[PDB]
Design a protein around this ligand. Structure first.
Ligand SMILES: CCCCCCCCCCCCC/C=C/[C@@H](O)[C@@H](N)CO
Lengths: 268, 235, 283, 62, 71, 235, 90, 62, 59
């Protein structure tokens, strides 16, 4: 717009929450599909669904992590990461079934004198590799689901050797996308790159993806949010620089079925 | 002769195949059909008919006229369950052998809404209010009215209308469920409780039996035909 | 309207340029890929394109019979102390690597399945006795149905289950199967579990395998030699060829870069270094 | 004498109703294959065999 | 007219109720089975039903070669 | 019976054949499709998507997050190459494992125009001008800007627009090239150089990384489907 | 209704819960006013409201008390009494 | 019920469109062969998944 | 209004929490109510609107 409007400057508003950004590289809509409610033609569960709307379909800001020369990368799972977030987590646990889209806004600012590139990826059914070489598909429910704090990637695969009392957890190696495939190709998946010299953040609008119209949000995680350093953090001359990466996410057009007593998971 | 080329599958015998074949008894005078009453067109029709549930499959009651009788009493109000049952139509011992459960075991997949009807066989002078509940999977199976009350339920009031029907709505993640015990395709919990309490006057029996029946709603269907385990021929 | 076998777009004649328009310049950060073509960065001539993407289409890419398993059965001498060996295989595309890697280029899939059976037999003992032509019985046992315990028990009656009676020496057996998934599409990957670990309930009870849905997805293939025990022992092998027809696929993924290690995405130590040595400035 | 019918189409290819052709070779009906073109009926004669038609919204016994 | 392979009846959107009509209540003694459906005892959403009873038809149920003897 | 005569090919099993066959599960109630996002119709669609190149496959960097990073510096102008690469999409170690290279290895022949996009991951305060070159086969592979400048190239100027795309035009003698290293179907050389030199102010990092991506142009196609060497099952 | 219908026999249905009664003395609607959502003409707080619908607008059964010769009476307060009831209290 | 279609003709003999005839023998779609008559689609949903449509001649970032 | 230098970047969270609960002492709690994520750049200032949310017609 000769009037002023621009790709880099956006304003997102959901329920009682609003996000502003003066340095964005536009925004991405996974597979060109904007989140939507379950249609009658595609519906399964016959009971009147619970649609929290503004109470849950708003912006939740998770615990801010620190990016450094040493960082190999971070990972999160949806809905798992939002499981303890206000009215959204409450409605998710009270219902047998649930479906939801997301507006993922990854925030990470610095300075015209800093360097680095964060590869922000949205992966459908992001199944990760375990820490065991004597057994398989053994990663425990508690460890597979870190909740809000999420997990992290490792530059090296080090097998759990304690056969007696197994760590029973994931060993996601960075260059292999934590799942047996080459990172260089992760780009076939809905994503955006946070290149310090070009932009403050990454905005990904994710639709409800799955082999089913609606499923068990507590048993199954539809989307995986992977953040890896394509180009290592670097500043002026400081040998050990640091910058925060804040992750804010908002559930969308989300709905729930099969209402009963609240589900109290064994998360530890 | 017309040039032909044989393809894979040739000369094989597919027990499920559907082809024509020479008639061993040509021109045979076939005996016509007579309008015989009670004709069936679809196995599902039988599944839609109310069949009595063997609820009390306990060590001593099982395999006897007693397993069908769920005993109640004029005793004081308690939030504890009269009877707990898993929504596994084909696998759960109490449902697996009912007309519905039996037909389900000839198939690999099941879908749709079921309906549980309870008949109060106590005396006319006996009043009471019961709570019939249905709790979709994913949480702690209800062991107290409090929890059961929170999910799909019906507060049955005993009177002239002898029976009460509770519809277990088709609520599932997958388009179809498996005719066997399976964590992934689990149906949830069906439980029954005392809303208030069975009350009776003097000169009247403080204990009575309630019969329970299960049948399929018009939205119900089955698929992937298969051999059942409910019958065998060891030898 | 555009057909898989339609000729790709013709290359258009392009001359010199001195403008404010910058096709060559862009910003991968946005998540998008520059839709550029030769004529955007260099002077091109007019070319009538005849080439097609016919063979690279989803159906064309998989339109080939692939080996998913090798079943071993046999028919010993009545006398032998050891049992007549009949095969029981849990149906799947993961026992072998080739077809699995191809299907795995994608998250979800949908398709009618064509199973072709190649049967080969042979003599095991430096004997000299012979054996009459064998007839195999390939029975499909869906999850819930009585799984056979003996090469000749009641289950082989197949009153309801689908059975294929194959005759040795004849054209390899073949049958078609519809999209039988309990879901709206096959899940090449399941980022979750079949069970929810409930605090209030004993640890061991709420436990289950990672990435594993229905303990018994699609039942099993039970194969046996119908013929009675023969003085001279004959061992047979059943090779199962699986071909995905009328197929559809969703959400693309990066191909499996390192040696498969079990039914899940798990990798194993010593196999994580696929790429070979090659210098930055060497052609 | 060819009998052309419609296939209720399940999983469709990335490729309008599809048809299948059938022809009877034998003179005897018994020799013929199964059409599978069968009809459904309402369970009434078994689920509600009662003389006086019943209305679900109203009291079964009155 | 109804074909064995025709899609089963669609589930209709149903709201709250405070009436003299008693579907849930009945009397099995009469010999009949309560023709009830989810929308009669609970609040339901509108659902377009695609499922069929094709495979459960008399012919389909028996349309399989079964072993009756070994000579 | 109709007179027929069997021809060669009869009773044979062609893994690539395309015929009809009896259905093992007749009348089976198939579960309908739901409008699932991200549907693909042609493998080439994936080849048209930008995928990161493992350029620095050196002894110590290979098989680690580092192989993806091509390091530059504020050092003085030199006509020497920043990185040399052969136009062998399917065979060359640096291209063979990229989404494009991987799909190419399922096919015997490849044709059309490729496009190489380079992303400058250095600081905003850092300026510079690089020369991205493409030299069609038949001559001495460019080892100096002078030679590289003489063929198909693009002078990339670093600024607001983070990245720069160089299109490698479909220039070949044969209608199709082989998905393997072959003198006859050789594609030529892709090399990168310093047009001027990466310049940076004080208090700023004199060294930065540039990422590189490869993808196929709309004129690109593959043929003769085949089994790949990028995966195996020894045992 | 000559068809059967009666004042004493009712069936109430809210969300996933249904209540039946064969012995009722009809039902009362306070001040002749049936519950309703807040109208625009009468609204105060400007923010988009949260309407739980079926998740909260259903039947919660409180702890059953005992009536005896000695009982003087019982009392409850709304919403207080439902404060800990599933999604409504939340 | 015969389905007649056109063969995209490659190497022509020293010998006008050529056709091939197809007929479905079975009642079940699954039993049917692969038509290979498939459709192409534009990569957009993957190569350009961005909210604001992009013009190649202009600055990606503005 | 951000009166710091042009070379200085940053992202702040401005929050508004309607009465009745524990007054926010941590981003976590504040994030849960009416708020605005202010991103520092060319546009020097950022405005957060505290909507008329009250039980009584007047305070
Ligand atoms: C007489 C022979 C009868 C043959 C019966 C075969 C029926 C069973 C076919 C199952 C098809 C499984 C295909 C692969 C599905 C997997 O990807 C699943 N884990 C994904 O949902």
């Amino acid at each position: 717009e000769a009037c002023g409007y621009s790709d880099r400057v956006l304003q997102l508003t959901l329920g009682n929450s609003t996000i502003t950004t003066q340095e964005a590289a536009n925004s991405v809509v996974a597979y060109g599909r904007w989140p939507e409610y379950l249609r009658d033609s595609e519906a399964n569960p016959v009971d009147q669904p619970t649609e929290p709307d503004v109470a849950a379909c708003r912006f939740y800001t998770l615990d801010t992590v620190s990016w450094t020369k040493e960082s190999r990368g971070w990972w999160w799972k949806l809905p798992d990461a939002l499981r303890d977030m206000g009215l959204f987590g409450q409605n998710m646990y009270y219902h047998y079934l649930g479906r939801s889209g997301y507006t993922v806004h990854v925030q990470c600012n610095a300075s015209k004198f800093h360097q680095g590139a964060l590869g922000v990826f949205a992966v459908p059914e992001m199944c990760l590799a375990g820490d065991s070489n004597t057994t398989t598909m053994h990663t425990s429910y508690q460890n597979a689901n870190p909740g809000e704090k999420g997990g992290t990637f490792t530059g090296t695969f080090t097998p759990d050797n304690n056969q007696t009392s197994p760590a029973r957890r994931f060993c996601p190696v960075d260059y292999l996308l934590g799942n047996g495939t080459l990172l260089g190709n992760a780009f076939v998946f809905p994503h955006q790159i946070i290149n310090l010299r070009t932009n403050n953040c990454a905005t990904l609008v994710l639709p409800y993806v799955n082999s089913l119209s609606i499923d068990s949000m507590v048993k199954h995680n539809n989307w995986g949010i992977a953040i890896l350093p394509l180009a290592p953090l670097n500043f002026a001359s400081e040998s050990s620089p640091e910058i925060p990466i804040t992750l804010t996410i908002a559930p969308m057009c989300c709905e729930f079925n099969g209402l009963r007593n609240i589900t109290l998971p064994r998360l530890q | 002769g017309l040039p032909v080329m044989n393809t894979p599958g040739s000369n094989q015998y597919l027990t499920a195949d559907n082809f024509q074949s020479p008639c061993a008894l040509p021109e045979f005078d076939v005996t016509p059909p007579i309008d015989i009453p009670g004709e069936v067109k679809n196995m599902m029709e039988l599944a839609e008919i109310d069949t009595m549930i063997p609820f009390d499959l306990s060590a001593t009651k099982k395999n006897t006229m007693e397993m069908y009788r769920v005993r109640l009493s004029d005793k004081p109000h308690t939030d504890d369950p009269i009877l707990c049952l898993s929504l596994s139509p084909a696998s759960d011992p109490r449902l697996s052998h009912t007309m519905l459960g039996e037909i389900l075991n000839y198939y690999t997949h099941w879908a749709g809404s079921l309906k549980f009807t309870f008949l109060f066989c106590g005396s006319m002078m006996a009043t009471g209010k019961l709570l019939v509940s249905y709790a979709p999977p994913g949480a702690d199976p209800p062991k107290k009215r409090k929890e059961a009350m929170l999910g799909t339920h019906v507060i049955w009031d005993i009177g002239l209308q002898s029976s009460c029907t509770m519809v277990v709505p088709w609520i599932s993640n997958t388009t179809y469920r498996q005719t066997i015990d399976d964590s992934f395709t689990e149906g949830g919990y069906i439980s029954v409780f005392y809303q208030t309490r069975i009350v009776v006057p003097l000169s009247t029996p403080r204990e009575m039996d309630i019969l329970g029946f299960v049948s399929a709603c018009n939205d119900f269907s089955v698929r992937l035909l298969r051999d059942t385990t409910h019958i065998e021929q060891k030898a | 309207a555009a057909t898989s076998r339609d000729a790709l777009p013709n290359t258009e004649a392009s001359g010199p340029t001195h403008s404010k328009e910058i096709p060559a310049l862009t910003a991968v950060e946005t998540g998008a890929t520059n839709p550029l073509v030769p004529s955007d960065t260099v002077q091109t001539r007019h070319v009538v394109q005849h080439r097609s993407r016919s063979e690279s289409s989803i159906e064309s890419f998989f339109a080939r019979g692939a080996c998913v398993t090798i079943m071993t059965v046999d028919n010993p001498a009545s006398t032998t102390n050891k049992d007549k060996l009949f095969a029981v295989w849990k149906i799947t595309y993961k026992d072998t690597v080739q077809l699995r890697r191809k299907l795995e280029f994608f998250t979800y899939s949908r398709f009618d399945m064509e199973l072709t059976f190649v049967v080969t037999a042979n003599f095991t003992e430096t004997n000299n006795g012979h054996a009459l032509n064998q007839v195999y019985q390939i029975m499909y046992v869906p999850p819930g149905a009585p799984v056979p315990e003996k090469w000749d028990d009641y289950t082989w009656q197949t009153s309801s289950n689908p059975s294929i009676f194959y005759t040795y020496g004849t054209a390899p057996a073949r049958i078609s199967v519809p999209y039988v998934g309990i879901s709206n599409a096959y899940s090449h990957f399941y980022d979750g579990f079949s069970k929810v670990p409930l605090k209030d309930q004993s640890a061991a009870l709420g436990d289950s395998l990672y990435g594993a849905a229905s303990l018994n997805d699609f039942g099993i293939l039970a194969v046996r030699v119908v013929n009675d025990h023969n003085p001279t022992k004959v061992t047979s092998k059943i090779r199962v060829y699986l071909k995905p027809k009328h197929i559809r696929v969703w959400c693309p993924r990066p191909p499996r870069a390192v040696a498969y290690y079990g039914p899940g995405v798990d990798y194993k130590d010593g196999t994580l270094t696929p790429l070979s040595t090659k210098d930055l400035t060497t052609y | 004498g060819a009998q052309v019918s419609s296939q209720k189409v399940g999983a469709h290819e990335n490729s309008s109703t599809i048809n299948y052709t059938t022809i009877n070779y034998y003179r005897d009906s018994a020799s013929n294959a199964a059409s599978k073109q069968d009809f459904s009926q309402d369970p009434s004669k078994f689920t509600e065999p009662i003389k006086d038609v019943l209305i679900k919204t109203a009291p079964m016994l009155n």
